[PDB]
Paper text:
Prostaglandin F2α (PGF2α), an endogenous arachidonic acid metabolite, regulates diverse physiological functions in many tissues and cell types through binding and activation of a G-protein-coupled receptor (GPCR), the PGF2α receptor (FP), which also is the primary therapeutic target for glaucoma and several other diseases. FP folds into a canonical seven-transmembrane helical domain (TMD).
Latanoprost acid (LTPA), 17-phenyl-13,14-dihydro PGF2α, is an active metabolic form of LTP. LTPA and TFPA bond to FP in nearly identical binding poses as PGF2α did, displaying a similar “L”-shape configuration in these two solved structures. Likewise, the carboxylate groups of LTPA and TFPA form strong polar interactions with R2917.40, T184EL2, and Y922.65, the ethylene linkage in the α-chain forms a lone pair-π29 interaction with M1153.23, and the two hydroxy groups in the F ring form hydrogen bonds with S331.39 and T2947.43. The derivatized ω-chain in LTPA also directly binds to FP. Interestingly, besides forming a hydrogen bond with H812.54, the hydroxyl group in the ω chain forms an additional hydrogen bond with S1183.35, which only exists in FP, indicating that this residue is of vital importance for the selectivity of LTPA to FP. Consistent with this finding, mutation of this serine to alanine or asparagine significantly reduced the potency of LTPA to induce FP activation.
Numbering used by the authors:
A (entry chain A): 5 to 55, 181 to 361
B (entry chain G): 5 to 58
C (entry chain B): 8 to 345
D (entry chain E): 1 to 119, 136 to 191, 193 to 247
E (entry chain R): 29 to 237, 240 to 323
């Protein structure tokens, strides 16, 4: 056999060892995608996690578990093309400004579009209803409520299992639960049972945000293991 | 006034493009067929070449 | 006054369409019916390349039919040896969301890009032995969709910002910027003459671009959805465009109209990559149905199917000599067919 | 790129010595190191070889058991521990880097080397040892081998090295395929058995000795060396 | 009697072939999503079980088809030692690879993040190789101790010395085999019970809408815990009694052969309760069988 061929085979073996060493780290870390319109407070969420670039990167550690959060910085409005590259990720974080009711319809439409995507139909979508304090203040002001924009709010009542936090006004509870019900009925529709949403109420100063991320990611990986054990 | 600029630019582009000459489809089809038949001998995918030459 | 220009543009479009139809003397089928069929072109996997850590999205062959470069979203560019399967190089990319790669004809430089909007040109013949970033150029406001080398000092790149630009490596500045389509650009294809190249966009249109003169000479609108693949005919007179409509259309520059539409009722998945054989009779298009089908350019009949993949076939390319065909898929396996 | 050797000097019979070499300006681990000895007023002779990551090591049948090669990747340094030094070991050792892959150029950079004084396979035989020539004429150095170097894959494993007065051997051709850093004047031709190094125009920088080497098999063997004067 | 071993082989061969086919078809898909560690372990288990039933069934057919004249075809004590390794091995692999899998799914359900990020496929392959090496070692340990396997009273299979137990070496080997088997079974049962309890808790505590793959997992865990025990505990207890009570035991060779029959029915039914009895796999197999034929 040729000596140059043997040296090339040795170089290939070394490259394979390096690829395995890199794949180790690649599998160790988890990937997360953060989506949300400009109105949403995603920038504050990214900057608070102190625990012409077309893509932005953010890394944090929750309970020793490393997470990679990517957010598009400079791209056009369209999303159907570059969204395909972010498949195979651990989960997608969708942020929406629950206070402003005008942009709420566009947020629901974007969530439905991201949920029914043929390529992302196997990735769970994390939902963080940010800016709950502003929504509460607005609905308590009584000037403009959700009913002016959504007609179903006139005949929707708070569920029987709705557990509000101590000191919350019934109107705030009913509004947030109506928003959560809208999101859940948009998600379950054509859910396919392989990917589910995780609604969570948060604000711009809640330190438990990363904890919710870790909690729902621990469950997403669990479902992936059951489908494997069942050979779905 | 960017809309007027875009409109005039589109109109000038269409104008300069409409001047391109065009021929019948029959000539282009015959040329493509002749080209395909010419290089048919040097296409291992088309004509299976012996294993020794792979 | 703007409605006046709108109606003038509409009238010009109608005139162009009428002039184009007037030249439609006959269809390609009526001329290619008498020719003999290509027959069952059965292909077998000769080499199976493994080592990629993530989805394979882009690949390209160099001047020689032996070396092969492939790009994966793990941040690794691997130079594969099609004959011995040995890995030649491994480049750790600074951006993991790579979407395009190119191999310069000189065999010394290789470019790549993606969502980072930056095109990094890696030098393979560096005297230090290790791969070094020769030039990292920026300026695009969108993800890079495709890249192709014209020479060892000039490179053309497409971006999602709807505009294309020709770059000069030694300086790192846009030599000429094109007007742009009405949507994000997706694919590029250089003509064998190096003077012309056609690019496809999400607006279902294709425009013929000139390297020296930054203007569009011809525009095509035969597709009904986003064009995801495009390839020039070996003679440089025509090109095929792949779209998500599960149909591939062959556009001829001299005729300036669609000559053949490759489609089948049983196919509903979109096309992701298209390539021509050295002779042009065999059209190889990758479909989202996890299978790659071969089409007869003249007869439009399916000559074979390459179902040696388990995921979306994302990229495929035929060697300059037509000895073997490489098909890449998201399954992280790159197989070299006959 | 620099390869500075050290550890030379005078040694007594039966002693030992550790010749070190400092590498810089390139990925030392990525390049395989080759120790080549050169007896006084004589040709080159391969000694040992160490691959990348110490995954493979080879020695010459004449030096097996005595010399042992080792490389420290963390510090980018090479070491050669010699044992049972014989009187014949008087020679100048050179360290050469080589990377192997399709389109590469093994033995591209030769170090300054170090001087050390004491007290069946393919063989390359050159029919010519001296060729007097003046400016304006051409030269064609011939080479003969006992076995056809044309391997089944079709690669011509032929290497030419030009050593100038005071300088180390410089790579001219690694496979007809001209090497880097050398003008186009140098060219190679011939079959798997016979080879010829043809220079179109002879300049004042060709003065030196031209050495031939085969690379079909790992154990290397240099030729007598053809000297050109001008 | 021959008929018995032959019907017990062909069934196992077909079961393991179908299981290997389904496992490869599933690994070609799931490999792109996760480590597919469970699939790798299942494939390894089914493969080792298959080779078992073609190596021990072939030897048994050769020895029933030789009028049981061991003195004719077995004089140097070379074949009985091979239907001795091939017996011990098969057994201890089918159980000790049933334990490691239960330990995997136990961590995958109790600590998914840990099984995903910390446990790499390389570690799973290393554990599989180590289990195989330990199995073949325990199967070859008697040969490396100046002793060999003696022909059992049934004159149809060679195994550890059962009759005429005099020294403690045979007792030692029997007790070690029984202890290893019982420990593997207990570990598998404990892991399966923990996984089932965790699933039941996390599911009956949740009321969002999820439960598609939990009930099937609990059913599979219960089926495995039941079949493995009911089929192996008899043989293991028999070997333990023979080793501790010696020749004074009251049991006869008939019950030992029956327990052999039952343990050989943990390796036909293992390719079943692990893979072939899944809803998706069942429907796919049935549909393709109805369509092809
Ligand atoms: O006595 C008789 O009647 C026949 C005796 C020949 C014995 C077995 C024949 C074969 C079986 C192998 C079973 C084997 O893998 C069990 C492992 C095992 C060994 C020992 C102790 C516990 C467990 C296959 O199922 C097919 C065929 O029947």
């Amino acid at each position: 056999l040729s000596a140059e061929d043997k040296a090339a085979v040795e170089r290939s073996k070394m490259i394979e060892k390096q690829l395995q060493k890199d794949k180790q780290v690649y599998r160790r870390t988890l990937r997360l995608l953060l989506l949300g319109a400009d109105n949403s407070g995603k920038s504050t969420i990214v900057k608070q996690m102190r625990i012409t670039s077309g893509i932005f990167e953010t890394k944090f550690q929750v309970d020793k578990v490393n997470f990679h959060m990517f957010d598009v910085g400079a791209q056009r409005d369209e999303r159907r093309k570059w969204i395909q590259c972010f498949n195979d990720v651990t989960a997608i974080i969708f942020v929406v400004d629950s206070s402003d009711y005008n942009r709420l319809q566009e947020a629901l439409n974007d969530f439905k579009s991201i949920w029914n995507n043929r390529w992302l139909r196997t990735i769970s979508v994390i939902l963080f209803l940010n800016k709950q304090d502003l929504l509460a203040e607005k609905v308590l002001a009584g000037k403009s409520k959700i009913e002016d924009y959504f007609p179903e709010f006139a005949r929707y009542t708070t569920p029987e299992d709705a557990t509000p936090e101590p000191g919350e006004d019934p109107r705030v509870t009913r509004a947030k639960y109506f928003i959560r019900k809208e999101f859940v009925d948009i998600s379950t529709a054509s859910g396919d049972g392989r990917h589910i949403c995780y609604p969570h109420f948060t604000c711009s100063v809640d330190t438990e945000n990363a904890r919710r991320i870790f909690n729902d990611c621990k469950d997403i990986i669990l479902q992936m293991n059951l489908r494997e054990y069942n050979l779905v | 006034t960017a809309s007027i600029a875009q409109a005039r630019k589109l109109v000038e582009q269409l104008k300069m493009e409409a001047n391109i000459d065009r021929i019948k489809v029959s000539k282009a089809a015959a040329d493509l067929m002749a080209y395909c038949e010419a290089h048919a001998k040097e296409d291992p995918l088309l004509t299976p070449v012996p294993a020794s030459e792979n | 006054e703007l409605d006046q220009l709108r109606q003038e543009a509409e009238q010009l479009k109608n005139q162009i369409r009428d002039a184009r139809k007037a030249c439609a003397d006959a269809t390609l089928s009526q001329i290619t019916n008498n020719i003999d069929p290509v027959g069952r072109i059965q292909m077998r996997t000769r080499r199976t390349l493994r080592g990629h850590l993530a989805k394979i999205y882009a690949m390209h062959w160099g001047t020689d039919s032996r070396l092969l470069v492939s790009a994966s979203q793990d941040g690794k560019l691997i130079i594969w040896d099609s004959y011995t399967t040995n890995k030649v190089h491994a480049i750790p990319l600074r951006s993991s969301w790579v979407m395009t790669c190119a191999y310069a004809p000189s065999g010394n430089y290789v470019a790549c890009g993606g969502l980072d909007n930056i095109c990094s040109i890696y030098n393979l013949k560096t005297r230090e032995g290790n791969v070094r970033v020769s030039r990292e150029l920026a300026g695009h406001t969108g993800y890079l969709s495709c890249c192709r080398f014209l020479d060892d000092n000039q490179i053309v790149t497409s971006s999602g910002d709807t505009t294309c630009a020709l770059w000069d490596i030694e300086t790192g500045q846009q030599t000429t910027t094109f007007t742009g389509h009405t949507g994000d650009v997706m694919s590029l294809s250089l003509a064998p003459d190096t003077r012309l190249f056609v690019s496809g966009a999400c607006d279902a249109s294709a425009k013929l671009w000139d390297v020296r003169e930054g203007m569009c000479r011809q525009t095509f609108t035969g597709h009904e959805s986003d064009i995801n693949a495009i390839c020039f005919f070996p003679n440089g007179n025509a090109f095929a465009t792949g779209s998500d409509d599960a149909t591939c259309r062959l556009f001829d520059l001299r005729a300036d109209q669609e000559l053949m539409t490759y489609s089948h009722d049983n196919i509903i998945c979109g096309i992701t990559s298209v390539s021509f054989s050295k002779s042009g009779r065999l059209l190889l298009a990758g479909y989202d149905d996890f299978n790659c089908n071969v089409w007869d350019a003249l007869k439009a009949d399916r000559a074979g199917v390459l179902a040696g993949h388990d995921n979306r076939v994302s990229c495929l390319g035929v060697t300059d000599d037509g000895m073997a065909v490489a098909t890449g898929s998201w399954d992280s396996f790159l197989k070299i067919w006959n | 790129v620099q390869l500075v050797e050290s550890g030379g000097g005078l040694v007594q019979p039966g002693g030992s010595r550790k010749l070190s070499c400092s590498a810089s300006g390139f990925a030392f681990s990525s390049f395989g190191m080759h120790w080549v000895r050169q007896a006084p007023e004589k040709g080159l002779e391969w000694v040992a070889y160490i691959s990348s990551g110490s995954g493979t090591i080879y020695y010459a049948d004449t030096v097996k058991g005595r010399f042992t090669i080792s490389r420290d990747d963390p510090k980018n340094t090479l070491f050669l521990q010699m044992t049972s030094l014989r009187s014949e070991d008087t020679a100048m050792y050179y360290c050469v880097r080589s990377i192997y892959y399709y389109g590469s150029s093994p033995f591209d950079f030769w170090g300054q080397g170090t001087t050390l004084t004491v007290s069946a396979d393919i063989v390359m035989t050159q029919a010519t040892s001296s060729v007097p020539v003046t400016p304006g004429e051409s030269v064609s150095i011939s080479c003969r081998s006992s076995k056809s170097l044309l391997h089944s894959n079709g690669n011509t494993y032929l290497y030419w090295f030009l050593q100038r007065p005071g300088q180390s051997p410089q790579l001219l051709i690694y496979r007809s395929n001209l090497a880097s850093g050398v003008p186009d004047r140098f060219s190679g031709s011939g079959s798997g058995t016979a080879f010829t190094l043809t220079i179109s125009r002879l300049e004042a920088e060709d003065v030196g000795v031209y050495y031939c080497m085969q690379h079909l098999e790992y154990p290397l063997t240099f030729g007598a060396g053809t000297k050109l004067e001008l | 009697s021959v008929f018995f071993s032959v019907i017990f082989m062909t069934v196992g061969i077909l079961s393991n072939s179908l299981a290997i086919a389904i496992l490869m078809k599933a690994y070609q898909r799931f490999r792109q999503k996760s480590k597919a560690s469970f699939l790798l372990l299942a494939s390894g288990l089914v493969i080792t079980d298959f080779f078992g039933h073609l190596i021990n069934g072939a030897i048994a057919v050769f020895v029933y088809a030789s009028d049981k004249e061991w003195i004719r075809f077995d004089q140097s004590n070379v074949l009985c030692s091979i239907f001795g390794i091939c017996m011990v091995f098969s057994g201890l692999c089918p159980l000790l690879l049933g334990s490691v899998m239960a330990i995997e799914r136990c961590i995958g359900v109790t600590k998914p993040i840990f099984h995903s990020t910390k446990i790499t496929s390389k570690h799973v392959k290393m554990m599989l190789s180590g289990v195989c090496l330990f199995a073949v070692f325990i199967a070859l340990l008697p040969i490396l101790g100046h002793r060999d396997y003696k022909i059992q009273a049934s004159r149809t299979w060679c195994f550890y010395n059962t009759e005429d137990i005099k020294d403690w070496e045979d007792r030692f080997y029997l007790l070690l085999f029984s202890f290893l088997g019982l420990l593997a079974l207990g570990v598998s049962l404990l892991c399966n019970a923990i996984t089932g309890i965790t699933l039941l808790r996390v599911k009956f505590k949740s009321q969002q809408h999820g439960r598609s793959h939990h009930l099937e997992m609990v059913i599979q865990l219960l089926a495995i815990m039941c079949v493995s025990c009911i089929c192996w505990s008899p043989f293991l207890v028999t070997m333990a009694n023979i080793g501790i009570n010696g020749n004074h035991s009251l049991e006869t060779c008939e019950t030992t052969l029956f327990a052999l029959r039952m343990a050989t029915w943990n390796q036909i039914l293992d390719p079943w309760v692990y893979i072939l009895l899944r809803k998706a796999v069942l429907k796919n197999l049935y549909k393709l069988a109805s369509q092809c034929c």
